[PDB]
């Protein structure tokens, strides 16, 4: 019995690594995209003017 | 504007400098290794913009 | 001295930390919905996948975001005196003797 | 219940015009470096090894042949491409977008080779993200060594005849190397009149062995010498000519033949490893018009 | 005619490939009891019963090869074949749209016309499959060119055992098989082995052991001999079986094919393209120590090979 | 569906000593002859083909190593061992341990070698059965390749003789290692070179005539990576066959033909079976591969 507890105590903890995982690419990409569109200040000063 | 350029050997087209660090006359080459006047002088990188 | 002389180029490169600049509603995102995928059978090793694609979208045409570098926290590369090894780059050419 | 997929992303969206190329195949054969389903581009096409910029070569792209892992291609979307990813002994359809264009046969073995045409015949230039795509020969198994074979023999005669070229006559070398002989047809190659640094490397290590080998089994006769020795040697006698057979240990010493046959033998396998597989799929099936077929693929 | 979807509806829903295992992530921790054919330790008890393993054994391996169809004139393909032979595929030139040409070892023994006592078993019966040797030889009038510059194995493709031959007056349909193990038509549930004369056969593993390991492995070689005899080269064939590795064999072929070499290099000398020998292609693996049944026919001698599984190969020069 | 595990009867008690010895290795290769569950220990290491009073080859175990099978350590249990076992297409988790140490990648290539470096640090001794078990090692094929390349060269030289710095100094780039040449059996590697015999001299007849005269215009002119052997100077051989004039349709049945037997020395130069390592950690050791037979 605890070692049937010694496995639902581990994957249903590998699949919350996954809940993480899935976060970080939230957190990750979503400013990924804004650096793959965000020139430097000493270009867009002189073209904000 | 007085004078028309520094060295005749780097903007002069067939010279020296321009062909020690040109992409066309690299086909010998090991590739892994990185040159910095590689950059000044490759024809297309520099007409990309 | 020998007939010529040269100009010499290098590099160096500068870790640094920047204040990006992020304005408001600059994106919509589409989040997608998520699934759990099975392959690389091993003896032991049930590898998955959990993927998930996420769409995104550029709402304002002007731009939204602005990256400035604003401290240098060491010199990595060093500004080293060593030239570079022109036998190792071209392993092929050579001259004619062997001597 | 496996599930394959390997999913090719690119930052930036394709051209309308090189979209239009790659709408023109839809299933084809690409060495791919990734065993995973997330991929950039930077290991698909051959530009790992074979590039613009340097030398194109031969064997770093064949040995990165059997190393690798082949895919096919399923369905191209503008953001991002799409494969199918090639399990050992799977069973898949391919068809052919492979210029210049050899017409297949059914019931046959294929093997995958290096291109060494022109870029217009081998590849898809992009200019959406700067790296290219390149796609293999995929030329079946008889037809790959006869197409490798007379290329190979004129690579050698055009160094003798850039060098001296009061030996070989261009009308008898041209009438008998563009044309491959097979299924009763004649199958034109091009010639490459820019001037070939494909096939350096294996007339360079060919000629290392058309003279250092029949020094080879001069040495090996006089070795172990028994009255029990296997049989079949004396029968080799006709085999090596009688010029050959006049060659002492003179012109050597004993510290030059264990600088000669240590290394000497290590050529032979660089040789044999190389030219005996490629990564080969069988296909039985095979339509004309539809240009359809099926395979199975042996890691070999 | 109502209750015949609901018999296709059964059988052909079931049988399918499995799935690919794909669950969404809003469900949870239940995506691990799709994992089943993993598992291989059942619990027993004191009474284990067929009707409480019926999962157990319900569980198998998704194993099921190809089929290549053919379809060849019934002049070269005999009528009677005995349903575990071994196929050719010949192929010249594309001259039809779809003109195949099979070959049996059964046939190649006449396309030689190799001397009798070298095979003197099935040159008896080779008289009552075929002619006399004019419908096989006309097809192909380059053979005697075949044997002189060396490429009639650079031509053949291996394909491996038989299914079925759905036989008609003039061509003959072939249903053939590759990958693995072909299954059977007028029986269901029941493989199709691969059947060998025993003149053709020639063992590897048998000595006194005076020992050999275990295994599960054990291969079928095939084999090839261009040579000349009564001064017209007539190719010549063999088979080969061990378990051993590729190391070891092309060593020990050499041990058999030993007194052919030593009188075929006197003809030559008393050339370039004369020097070629033979090739190997293997075609798969037969299970370890399954015993070969003997059979007979009308008499010759055929063994059978049960459970063979068959994976062909490329021709590599020995010599 | 399908088990795959080996546990081993040991019908004497370990002793202190050599329980460390399994301890020190959890995961190794070595090759048993009987595909069981359950095994004898008369069979389980590579000694039934080196053993001690004998004069062991290293031919022999390795034409003798592709007819075994391969398997993996699970655990030492001190009244019995446990092993795994290796399908012949099937994925796994391998854990190199080998100490004369290499380092490998992902998409690395492999064989199995007998030990061929020191018998006394990969055997062990049991006086717990009185029968000792050998080791093999895998090692990459860049070297792998290498360590097969000196024995035939080796055999060569020594009975010539009837001095070796020269031979058995296996070269990786930096790291040059002397072999084990004690007691060798040499007439498993005679026929060997009883094959090299013929086709060393088959390859010899159909030279062709253009890649002759190709060195004549290599080492004259210009220099090249490979061309040091020389040190620029044509052997004597080659100014006897090129005296006539070229002729491509008589080449080309001298390179084509030629080219069958490259095909050939694959026959001679084998391995036992290959590995290709797809995945690799470097602080685990652990890598990962589909075991191929060959």
């Known amino acids: 019995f605890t070692e049937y507890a010694g496995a639902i105590k581990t994957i249903t903890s590998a699949l919350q690594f996954g809940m993480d995982a899935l976060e970080r690419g939230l957190v990750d990409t979503v400013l990924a995209v804004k650096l793959r569109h965000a020139?430097?200040?000493?270009?867009?000063?002189?073209?904000?003017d | 504007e007085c004078r028309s350029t520094n060295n005749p050997w780097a903007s002069q087209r067939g010279s020296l400098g321009d062909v020690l660090y040109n992409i066309t006359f690299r086909q010998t080459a090991l590739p892994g290794m990185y040159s910095p006047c590689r950059q000044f002088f490759h024809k297309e990188d520099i007409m990309r913009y | 001295?020998?007939?010529?002389?040269?100009?010499?180029?290098?590099?160096?490169?500068?870790?640094?930390?920047?204040?990006?600049?992020?304005?408001?509603?600059?994106?919509?995102?589409?989040?997608?919905?998520?699934?759990?995928?099975?392959?690389?059978?091993?003896?032991?090793?049930?590898?998955?996948?959990?993927?998930?694609?996420?769409?995104?979208?550029?709402?304002?045409?002007?731009?939204?975001?602005?990256?400035?570098?604003?401290?240098?926290?060491?010199?990595?590369?060093?500004?080293?005196?060593?030239?570079?090894?022109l036998f190792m780059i071209f392993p092929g050419d050579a001259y004619q003797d062997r001597q | 219940?496996?599930?394959?997929?390997?999913?090719?992303?690119?930052?930036?969206?394709?051209?309308?015009?090189?979209?239009?190329?790659?709408?023109?195949?839809?299933?084809?054969?690409?060495?791919?470096?990734?065993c995973h389903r997330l991929q950039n581009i930077q290991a698909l096409g051959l530009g790992c090894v074979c590039s613009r910029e340097t030398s194109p070569d031969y064997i770093q792209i064949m040995q990165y042949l059997s190393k690798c892992?082949?895919?096919?291609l399923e369905e191209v979307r503008p953001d991002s491409l799409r494969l199918t990813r090639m399990d050992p002994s799977d069973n898949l359809q391919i068809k052919n977008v492979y210029a210049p264009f050899f017409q297949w046969d059914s019931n046959t073995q294929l093997a995958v080779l290096p291109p060494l045409f022109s870029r217009k015949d081998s590849t898809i230039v992009l200019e959406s993200n700067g790296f290219d795509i390149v796609f293999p020969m995929v030329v079946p198994q008889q037809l790959g060594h006869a197409i490798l074979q007379q290329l190979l023999v004129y690579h050698i005669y055009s160094k003798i005849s850039a060098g001296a070229p009061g030996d070989v006559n261009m009308a008898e070398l041209d009438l008998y190397t563009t044309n491959v002989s097979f299924m009763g047809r004649t199958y034109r190659l091009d010639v490459d009149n820019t001037d070939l640094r494909v096939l350096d490397d294996?007339?360079?290590?060919?000629?290392?062995?058309?003279?250092?080998?029949?020094?080879?089994?001069?040495?090996?006769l006089t070795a172990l010498v028994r009255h029990d020795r296997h049989p079949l040697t004396e029968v080799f006698e006709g085999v090596v000519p009688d010029e050959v057979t006049r060659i002492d240990l003179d012109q050597l010493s004993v510290p030059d033949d264990i600088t000669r046959m240590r290394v000497m033998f290590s050529y032979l396998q660089s040789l044999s490893s190389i030219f005996n597989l490629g990564p080969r799929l069988h296909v039985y099936a095979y339509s004309a018009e539809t240009l359809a077929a099926s395979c199975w693929y042996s890691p070999r | 005619?109502?209750?015949?979807?609901?018999?296709?509806?059964?059988?052909?829903?079931?049988?399918?490939?499995?799935?690919?295992?794909?669950?969404?992530?809003?469900?949870?921790?239940?995506?691990?009891?799709?994992?089943?054919?993993?598992?291989?330790?059942?619990?027993?008890?004191?009474?284990?019963?067929?009707?409480?393993?019926?999962?157990?054994?319900?569980?198998?391996?998704?194993?099921?090869?190809?089929?290549?169809?053919?379809?060849?004139?019934?002049?070269?393909?005999?009528?009677?074949?005995?349903?575990?032979?071994?196929?050719?595929?010949?192929?010249?030139?594309?001259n039809g749209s779809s003109m195949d040409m099979l070959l049996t070892p059964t046939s190649l023994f006449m396309l030689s016309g190799m001397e009798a006592a070298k095979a003197p078993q099935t040159h008896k019966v080779a008289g009552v499959w075929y002619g006399s040797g004019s419908g096989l030889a006309d097809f192909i009038p380059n053979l005697s060119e075949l044997m002189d510059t060396g490429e009639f194995h650079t031509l053949l493709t291996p394909v491996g055992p038989m299914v079925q031959s759905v036989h008609s007056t003039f061509v003959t349909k072939v249903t053939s098989a590759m990958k693995g193990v072909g299954l059977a038509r007028d029986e269901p549930r029941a493989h199709v082995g691969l059947t060998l004369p025993c003149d053709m056969l020639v063992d590897l593993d048998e000595s006194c052991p005076m020992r050999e390991p275990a295994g599960l492995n054990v291969t079928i070689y095939a084999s090839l001999v261009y040579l000349r005899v009564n001064q017209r080269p007539s190719?010549?064939?063999?088979?080969?079986?061990?378990?051993?590795?590729?190391?070891?064999?092309?060593?020990?072929?050499?041990?058999?094919?030993?007194?052919?070499?030593?009188?075929?290099?006197?003809?030559?000398?008393?050339?370039?393209?004369?020097?070629?020998?033979?090739?190997?292609?293997?075609?798969?693996?037969?299970?370890?120590?399954?015993?070969?049944?003997?059979?007979?026919?009308?008499?010759?001698?055929?063994?059978?090979?049960?459970?063979?599984?068959?994976?062909?190969?490329?021709?590599?020069?020995?010599?």
Not at chain 1, 39 to 48: E, Q, R, S, Y
Not at chain 3, 50 to 77: D, K, M, N
Not at chain 4, 69 to 72: D, G, K, P, S, Y
Request: proline share 6%; hydrophobic share 45%.
């Open chain 1, 39 to 48: 020139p430097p200040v000493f270009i867009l000063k002189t073209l904000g």
């Open chain 3, 1 to 85: 001295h020998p007939g010529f002389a040269m100009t010499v180029v290098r590099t160096d490169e500068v870790l640094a930390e920047h204040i990006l600049y992020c304005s408001r509603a600059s994106t919509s995102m589409f989040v997608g919905l998520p699934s759990v995928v099975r392959r690389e059978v091993r003896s032991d090793a049930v590898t998955f996948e959990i993927t998930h694609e996420i769409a995104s979208l550029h709402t304002a045409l002007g731009y939204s975001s602005v990256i400035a570098p604003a401290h240098v926290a060491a010199i990595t590369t060093d500004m080293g005196v060593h030239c570079q090894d």
């Open chain 4, 1 to 34: 219940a496996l599930d394959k997929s390997i999913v090719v992303n690119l930052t930036s969206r394709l051209f309308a015009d090189e979209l239009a190329a790659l709408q023109s195949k839809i299933g084809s054969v690409l060495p791919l470096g990734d």
């Open chain 4, 69 to 72: 892992t082949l895919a096919v």
């Open chain 4, 202 to 220: 294996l007339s360079m290590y060919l000629c290392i062995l058309s003279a250092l080998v029949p020094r080879g089994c001069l040495r090996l």
């Open chain 5, 1 to 94: 005619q109502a209750e015949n979807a609901a018999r296709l509806g059964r059988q052909v829903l079931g049988l399918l490939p499995p799935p690919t295992h794909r669950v969404s992530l809003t469900r949870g921790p239940e995506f691990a009891r799709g994992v089943r054919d993993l598992l291989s330790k059942y619990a027993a008890s004191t009474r284990p019963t067929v009707g409480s393993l019926h999962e157990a054994l319900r569980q198998a391996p998704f194993r099921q090869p190809t089929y290549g169809d053919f379809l060849v004139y019934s002049q070269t393909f005999s009528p009677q074949e005995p349903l575990g032979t071994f196929l050719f595929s010949f192929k010249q030139e594309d």
């Open chain 5, 235 to 319: 190719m010549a064939l063999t088979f080969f079986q061990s378990g051993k590795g590729f190391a070891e064999v092309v060593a020990m072929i050499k041990d058999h094919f030993t007194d052919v070499i030593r009188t075929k290099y006197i003809q030559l000398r008393h050339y370039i393209n004369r020097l070629v020998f033979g090739a190997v292609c293997t075609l798969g693996t037969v299970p370890f120590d399954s015993h070969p049944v003997h059979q007979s026919l009308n008499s010759l001698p055929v063994l059978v090979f049960a459970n063979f599984e068959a994976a062909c190969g490329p021709w590599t020069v020995f010599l």
